[PDB]
Symmetry: D3
Subunit: 242 residues, 6 copies
Amino acid sequence: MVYIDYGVADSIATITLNRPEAANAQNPELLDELDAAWTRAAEDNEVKVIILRANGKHFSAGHDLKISLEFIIQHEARRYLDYTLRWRNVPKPSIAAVQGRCISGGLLLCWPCDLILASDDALFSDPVALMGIGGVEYHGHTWELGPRKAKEILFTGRALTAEEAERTGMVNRVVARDELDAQTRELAEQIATMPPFALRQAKRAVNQTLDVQGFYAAIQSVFDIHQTGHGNALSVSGWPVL
Amino acid sequence: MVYIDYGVADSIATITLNRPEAANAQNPELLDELDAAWTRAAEDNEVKVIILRANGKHFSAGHDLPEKISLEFIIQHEARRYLDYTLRWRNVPKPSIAAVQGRCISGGLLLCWPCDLILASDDALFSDPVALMGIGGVEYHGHTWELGPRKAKEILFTGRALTAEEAERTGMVNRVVARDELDAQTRELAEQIATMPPFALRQAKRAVNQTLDVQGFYAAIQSVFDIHQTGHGNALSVSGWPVL
Amino acid sequence: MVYIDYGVADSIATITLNRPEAANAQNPELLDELDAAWTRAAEDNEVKVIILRANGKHFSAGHDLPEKISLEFIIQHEARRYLDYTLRWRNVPKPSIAAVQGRCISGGLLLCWPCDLILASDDALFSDPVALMGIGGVEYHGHTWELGPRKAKEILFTGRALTAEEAERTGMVNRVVARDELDAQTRELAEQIATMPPFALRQAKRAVNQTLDVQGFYAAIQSVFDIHQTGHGNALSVSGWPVL
Amino acid sequence: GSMVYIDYGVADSIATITLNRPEAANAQNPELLDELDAAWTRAAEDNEVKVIILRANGKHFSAGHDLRPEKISLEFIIQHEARRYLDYTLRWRNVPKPSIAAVQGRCISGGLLLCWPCDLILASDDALFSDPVALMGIGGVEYHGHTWELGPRKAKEILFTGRALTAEEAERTGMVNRVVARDELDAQTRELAEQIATMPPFALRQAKRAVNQTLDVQGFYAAIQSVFDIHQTGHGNALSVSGWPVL
Amino acid sequence: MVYIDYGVADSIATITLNRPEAANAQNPELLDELDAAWTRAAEDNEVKVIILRANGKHFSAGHDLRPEKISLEFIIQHEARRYLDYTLRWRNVPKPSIAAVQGRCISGGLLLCWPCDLILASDDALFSDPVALMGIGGVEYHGHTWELGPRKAKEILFTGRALTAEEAERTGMVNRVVARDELDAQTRELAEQIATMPPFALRQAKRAVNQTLDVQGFYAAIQSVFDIHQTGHGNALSVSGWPVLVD
Amino acid sequence: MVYIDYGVADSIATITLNRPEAANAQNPELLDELDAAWTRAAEDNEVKVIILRANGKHFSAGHDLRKISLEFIIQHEARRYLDYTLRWRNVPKPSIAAVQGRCISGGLLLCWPCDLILASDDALFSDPVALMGIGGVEYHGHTWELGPRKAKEILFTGRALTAEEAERTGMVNRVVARDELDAQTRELAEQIATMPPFALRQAKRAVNQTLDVQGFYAAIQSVFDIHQTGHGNALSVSGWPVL
Ligand SMILES: [Zn+2]
Ligand SMILES: [Zn+2]
Ligand SMILES: [Zn+2]
Ligand SMILES: [Zn+2]
Ligand SMILES: [Zn+2]
Ligand SMILES: [Zn+2]
């Protein structure tokens, strides 16, 4: 793998975004590698916990940017919707460690994790409105932030600090930048002492509550609204964005 | 009003589609008049029951089909006339009954589905072949609710017509009647309902419609409207026109 | 007890409405005895299946109708006997089968709808004409679930009865049978079901009921209970009596 | 542009709708509410308006519904309240452009129906939010935003006690987006509105829709309808006990 | 490969269950080859419609039942993959699919046809799920309540009886019933007719209906009942030491 | 009553857990007496508000654990851990839990069904039942009360939340000094009992019905079965209901 580093030790799989030269901007190849890494961790009976982390200053700058809407949907449904939900549902605990900028598409990498630790310098945003689109393809915003804060960041394009995100429940813990990796691995190690079936079913309990609340249906619903963004952009310019 | 007849007699308002020369195809002018008629009936205290019906052989052939049209522009117009109007009719707090004869095609379904009850003549044919134009069903997706998911997928995938008898079997149609008795049986039913206390009728309607909304009807209608709009998006991207 | 016969034999508990002289009309005493019967069957580990049936010609005519009566007073009584009892019967973790003959009117539906399966004689007639009294259907709104929304509105708006065959076509009735054969065929069905492992039956029942609750059944039943109470509220505000 | 009780102006793509009954602490009579609705419709239909600001003159945002026929039926009450307290409020919620409420001083009971349908809420540090309508025999106002905006435990707390939440308390539940100094409330609201108005209108429309449709899939429309009936049982009880719609 | 024939002709992909000597009973190898056929059909741009059919007298007798100490975890891991995830994946393939069901379709057989969009049944077809005999509350993917309504679903689960083609049609589970001799021909004719439609129209039509179902609670209910099914295996393990009940 | 104290004064019913010898761990007899106390309060027309509190240093250490089929376990747990809890939740009068010290696992089933929760500054809430092989307790308030990320964190790690952390998720209405908990709970109860009972009943209904429309009843039922797969697995591995 060119863009993703994978290691297993002490029952923990660590998946590292390794394209620091582009601020971990996501091309298709990177997303395919990342999905392969998640599947590896899912299928390795030695792995009890997964860490998602990133090299460099910034967790991820987002997606690396006649075209039909049909074509756009085919590609986005696979890599931005189905991959993300598949990661969400992997039956073992996962923790994202987020430093620096996590922008638009970056949210699709950390939101599917169960827990999020952020460094004090982390900044979460989704400014895709500038491009004519109503938020990224997988709409965690309302669930993670509450509707008022979700609209605030979509409408203004501003960034939320790590402490703001912690206040909405999107981030579990804010930690000093130099301690982010250490504190993440220590959490993962504590979780790995639990019986794997108990962790599987705890995760299932919370995620199934969310799905009964309408999470799956809402994610699908908003994916369609997202696609009208692209449809409008195409109708106006012939390009997927404004 | 040019296209819609409106009359009140014996506590009953009758709303009539009167464009038989175009098989009651729906332009914006007909829809704006139809909405004004629904409002008139809703606001007239002497009206207890509403009948929606149509002159001629066919109930409605559907929707009557700016250099660069934007999907934004399409959405604004369709959200007003095909979504908001339809839902407003659905929620009028008085019983309504649609009397459907002959062809009821695509947009025609948006006129009768918001009614509480539907009577159909034996010659009635219900269809939505808009897949032919590149779109996944009309703007207001009653299909799954009215027909069940398999029958909805069947008529959307094939563009075929359902008979009045087939529609009765799914529960979309309350009763099938002879063509020459359609108006008479509709009025007899309306009259029997109009003997009930208005507030009882209001809360019976509310009970069933609220059950539907709890089951997800409002949310699902809004959801499929966006799916519908991706159809227009795709067509605009391929041809520069809203349909294929 | 006074209004309800209870017996157990070959792993089947038979609960019989035994007030044929008032067409099994439901007063509080009868309902309390019925609830006690359901509970006794629920708690007896020898009972694998429950049959609910009725003596005389009619399953049930429905509910048998202090200075100033408050809405609060009505709510307290109705929440217990018409809402909580009915849901509790619904959730008893053993299969239950209602045998319905003749007229099952308004509150009569609260007795059979909570059973898992319903067998009806070919003379059975189901109705809810409570709109006549100013109310939007009975307290437990199974109508939309059992009949579909259009048929539910139809019977609430008109007060008309559905035959056994009409009810079977919506899925409310599992099987229509000759009047003379209703009991025998119910008993045989119970006996066949009682040969299954009790925990398989419990979880089959739970699978279906839980699908209903995810669909919104519990929430909708609670929502329409309030709509119903607005009926009593209006009747009180207009006459000082809970019904018009 | 303006009407009796509502001031209305457009400038730089922003429509500002101003409650203008400060001598009555913006108590809402039917006339004010019909005018407010007509203002929301004007801003919705005006293609030059990109963002809506809802604000209020005087010391208080709104004291709620104005208290000030032979036999009053529950039917009569439902007809009036369904129109002005349920249908108006939902329509404002659904206007396809961003809206921002600027809330100062008291926002009591029916006041909540004016700000809750806005997308964003900015509150001054002296803002106080409450719904003490339990004192009148009723289980919260007609449009039950409480559980969604505050969480169930806080919603029950304020309805059971009738107490006020400070602007900072409301911010912690996510009901208030930002708390600001009283003298800066108007300036900061305008500045936020101007920033939002630089965005493409269709991107804003679909962002708003994404969030509101998530809410509706979560059960928002259905729950609001459900609680409206619970509310009406309150009036039903009051009428049955006293012949008046409240205690 | 060994148990599944796959072919493409005139924009139609036909997947045939080819284990008639075991009444198309499903081992893991058959299920893996079946999932591979669905993926091959989904990924081929030249495929516009999918047919699922079966050789022999019977569509599928279901899961072929014939591990040191068996844990529930072990069963869940296996069933979640092949009975839940496969089935939902097939359900969501973004092209129309048609099942042609002849003869017996029992228990896990339902998992093969229920994910298809349309079902044509021969008049000889018999649908049943008698898995309560084994201690379990219906098969792993609970389409029963959706396809049949709750009273008919409970009836077939409580009794273990079969529904005729005609009974299934009356609940909406079967789209059409045809003569056993005409099943294959009528299915092909239906697929060709559908294959003349614009692929993106068909995709969004399928999506419109399936998304209505998921807003109604389909995905969440399927997940919820999966766990209820697993309590059946938990109980059986606790009573018989085996994943299903034995005499 | 052996384990539960019950008293009525000035329209307030006070229900006190009185098994400090086991940190108010819950056996079947304690749970039956608690359910009888809630029913008593529900039915007494002079009770307007209910307080649930606990003697000694700790609110409740959870279910008292000190061969069976899964069927047997489900029968017992559905009655006492699922049905009892939902019944308390739905009692048509305001209820307030006063929670001091440790509230562990099953303890949560006693306070969560209360409308409001006041906690002392030393209260600690946890659910470390993953240690026993089970995916959280039988009545899954966690996601509702804490949000999903915090719910997963406490179930995965087994750690305790402080009163102040619980307050930040909205699970706790107010944090008070230990010595003042009883007094602040009774004053809050007295204030609430000045309101019209029908208004309080319908305010309660409005919020709980919003929750049920959001999926609360359905979700609770769904997680019950997930919890029971915990027991099924434990039985399949160790012969016992836990690991
Ligand atoms: Zn995109
Ligand atoms: Zn259109
Ligand atoms: Zn009543
Ligand atoms: Zn009111
Ligand atoms: Zn299985
Ligand atoms: Zn347990």
